[PDB]
Design a binder for this molecule. Structure first.
Ligand SMILES: CCCCCCCCCCOP(=O)([O-])OCC[N+](C)(C)C
Lengths: 54, 54
């Protein structure tokens, strides 16, 4: 968010990448994968970046 | 937060541990360190765990 720092967002993005590459996760619909990352507190941009990197 | 999976919260807690171990950070008042982590999106439960592991 607007008052946060990259240091604390970067591990969430990194985990999200590993999440999106995981064989269990990949069996769920794209929207469900995105909703899961949203419930993890990731911003729309962070989710989009995770998908790019995955 | 409570809805987060350990897969995502543990790496964040790990990041908070590194934060709390930092020499400059340790110079700041306790309340300031906790509040900094709160504005990063950690809950008191997660901050307590960070301190526990620090
Ligand atoms: C390496 C990444 C693989 C992650 C693959 C993870 C598979 C999802 C498991 C379902 O998660 P959850 O139960 O919503 O979260 C746990 C949070 N609590 C149980 C609500 C407290």
């Amino acid at each position: 968010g607007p008052l946060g720092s990259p240091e604390f967002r970067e591990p969430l993005i990194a985990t999200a990448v590993k999440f999106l590459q995981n064989s269990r996760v990949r069996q769920s619909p794209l929207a469900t994968r995105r909703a899961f990352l949203k419930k993890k507190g990731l911003t729309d941009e962070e989710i989009d970046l995770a998908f790019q990197q995955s």
